[PDB]
Amino acid sequence: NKMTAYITELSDMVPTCSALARKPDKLTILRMAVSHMKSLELKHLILEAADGFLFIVSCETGRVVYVSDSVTPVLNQPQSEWSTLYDQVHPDDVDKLREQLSRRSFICRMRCGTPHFVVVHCTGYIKAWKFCLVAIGRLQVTTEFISRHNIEGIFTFVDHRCVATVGYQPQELLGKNIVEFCHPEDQQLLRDSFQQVVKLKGQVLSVMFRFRSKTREWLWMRTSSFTFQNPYSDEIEYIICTNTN
Amino acid sequence: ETEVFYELAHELPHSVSSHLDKASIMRLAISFLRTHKLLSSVCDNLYLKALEGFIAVVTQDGDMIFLSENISKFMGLTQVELTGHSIFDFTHPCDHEEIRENLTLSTERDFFMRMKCTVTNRTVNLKSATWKVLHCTGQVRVLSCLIIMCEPIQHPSHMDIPLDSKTFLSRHSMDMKFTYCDDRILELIGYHPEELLGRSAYEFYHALDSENMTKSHQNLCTKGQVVSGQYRMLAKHGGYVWLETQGTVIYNPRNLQPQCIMCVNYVLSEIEKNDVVFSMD
Numbered sequence: 001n002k003m004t005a006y007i008t009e010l011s012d013m014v015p016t017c018s019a020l021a022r023k024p025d026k027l028t029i030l031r032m033a034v035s036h037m038k039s040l041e042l043k044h045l046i047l048e049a050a051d052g053f054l055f056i057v058s059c060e061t062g063r064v065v066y067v068s069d070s071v072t073p074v075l076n077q078p079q080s081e082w083s084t085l086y087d088q089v090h091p092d093d094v095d096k097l098r099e100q101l102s103r104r105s106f107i108c109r110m111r112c113g114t115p116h117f118v119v120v121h122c123t124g125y126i127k128a129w130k131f132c133l134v135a136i137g138r139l140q141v142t143t144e145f146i147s148r149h150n151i152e153g154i155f156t157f158v159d160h161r162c163v164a165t166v167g168y169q170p171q172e173l174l175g176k177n178i179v180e181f182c183h184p185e186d187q188q189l190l191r192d193s194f195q196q197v198v199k200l201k202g203q204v205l206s207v208m209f210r211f212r213s214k215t216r217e218w219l220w221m222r223t224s225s226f227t228f229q230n231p232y233s234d235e236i237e238y239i240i241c242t243n244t245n
Numbered sequence: 246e247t248e249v250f251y252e253l254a255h256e257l258p259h260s261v262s263s264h265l266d267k268a269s270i271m272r273l274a275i276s277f278l279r280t281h282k283l284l285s286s287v288c289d290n291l292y293l294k295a296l297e298g299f300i301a302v303v304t305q306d307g308d309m310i311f312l313s314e315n316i317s318k319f320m321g322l323t324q325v326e327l328t329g330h331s332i333f334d335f336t337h338p339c340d341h342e343e344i345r346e347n348l349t350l351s352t353e354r355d356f357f358m359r360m361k362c363t364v365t366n367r368t369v370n371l372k373s374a375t376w377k378v379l380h381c382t383g384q385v386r387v388l389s390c391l392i393i394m395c396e397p398i399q400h401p402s403h404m405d406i407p408l409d410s411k412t413f414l415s416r417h418s419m420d421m422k423f424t425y426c427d428d429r430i431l432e433l434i435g436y437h438p439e440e441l442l443g444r445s446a447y448e449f450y451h452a453l454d455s456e457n458m459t460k461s462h463q464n465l466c467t468k469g470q471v472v473s474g475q476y477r478m479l480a481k482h483g484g485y486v487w488l489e490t491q492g493t494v495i496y497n498p499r500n501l502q503p504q505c506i507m508c509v510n511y512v513l514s515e516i517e518k519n520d521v522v523f524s525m526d
């Protein structure tokens with residue numbers, strides 16, 4: 001039944017066979033497959049799968065001896081423009097590059113033009129031609145300030161936006177507890193949510209309190225807090241907070 | 246019927262085509278022109294060799310209508326044994342449903358699936374295959390279709406490719422506490438192993454990244470192999486650096502137990518936001 005379904009499928013796939021008034025036989029069906037491919041890309045599969053392109057450089061000096069045209073779709077450059085890989089790569093990657101010049105494999109962020117860099121996973125090998133690298137570079141898939149706390153409320157992490165949001169340089173904020181900056185009247189409430197976000201392990205509460213500015217102005221703020229747990233231990237390593245003016 | 250078949254076979258190497266059966270020259274013929282149907286809609290020894298992986302096209306209902314020729318170099322099973330048979334017949338059932346919904350229906354896909362391996366780190370055969378995690382990135386495209394390249398993650402106890410300056414090894418407990426680090430990282434990121442030892446890896450990632458690590462970590466555990474995205478570990482005296490790490494779970498070969506996680510960590514950037522300070526350390 002499956003040989004026949006291959007017989008039938010094959011013929012459906014041979015336009016020369018399936019453009020016919022009837023269904024012929026296997027000797028014939030086998031025969032017209034044979035001629036239909038006796039009649040009659042990988043880089044498209046590559047660029048269609050990973051947004052990769054091929055390129056060939058000299059190992060001795062790092063200058064290009066071949067570039068696939070996929071460079072234009074992949075990273076917007078003209079094949080005519082793609083020279084020396086060192087000119088194409090981010091300056092902070094020259095070093096890395098030079099020791100990759102057995103097979104080879106690495107990563108580096110190369111420019112795009114119309115200064116923007118795109119990180120590209122590179123794969124290939126060295127062949128003799130005083131030698132050459134044969135590689136494929138592929139592309140990858142992808143007001144408020146955020147802080148983070150140990151269970152007790154001590155600032156373990158803050159991003160620079162704290163100075164824009166509360167006026168304190170990170171360092172002043174870090175190490176201290178938040179309730180040190182809360183307004184007295186609101187402090188249990190802050191602690192409450194801290195007593196709560198843990199009790200409600202996993203997901204968020206939000207709490208609002210007057211936070212101390214550096215110029216000492218009490219500021220209304222809303223904080224969205226959730227505990228973050230180890231994916232292995234389920235240990236509550238920290239609770240993450242985004243504190244929002 | 247043998248004469249017609251063996252020049253069908255030998256206009257599909259005449260070496261490998263000399264040995265094909267009925268059902269398989271059927272499958273290879275059928276899938277060759279089926280593939281050609283998709284390529285018309287998309288639009289070598291070095292292309293093929295220069296891949297740390299093979300390319301596969303897989304239908305929304307699961308058939309493998311084409312696999313990379315170099316497939317056998319990574320997974321042992323050659324191009325001709327598995328073409329046209331189901332992907333579901335060669336990958337982990339616990340991964341299957343996730344594979345199913347990657348075949349289904351934003352175009353870009355990126356994930357990890359365990360297949361079957363029958364090439365030793367020479368060759369053994371199906372009853373003694375081992376499951377091999379594959380990192381797969383591609384497009385799903387219109388009958389639907391999946392076009393992924395599949396890269397195996399090099400195992401860090403047995404590596405073939407050199408490693409440059411900007412990479413540093415690392416060992417962790419299964420919950421990812423640093424339980425050993427490379428000495429250079431100091432010159433790289435600026436920490437001696439001493440401080441890192443006994444420390445959760447998670448108090449060194451920048452906060453916006455922690456959620457994306459969890460997935461990498463659970464992939465690592467459930468499958469035992471993984472590549473992270475880009476992320477930034479916080480650095481010595483302020484700023485961070487960008488890393489990509491291959492993380493594999495290594496076992497004691499004596500008691501069949503998970504022992505630790507070893508990670509190769511490619512540094513991709515020098516310190517950035519050096520002025521700013523993020524964490525207590």
Ligand SMILES: Brc1ccc([C@H]2CN3CCSC3=N2)cc1
Binds near residue numbers: 478
């Ligand atoms: Br996947 C994955 C996620 C994290 C890690 C470890 C290794 N390493 C290098 C500096 S920060 C850090 N955490 C390994 C694999």
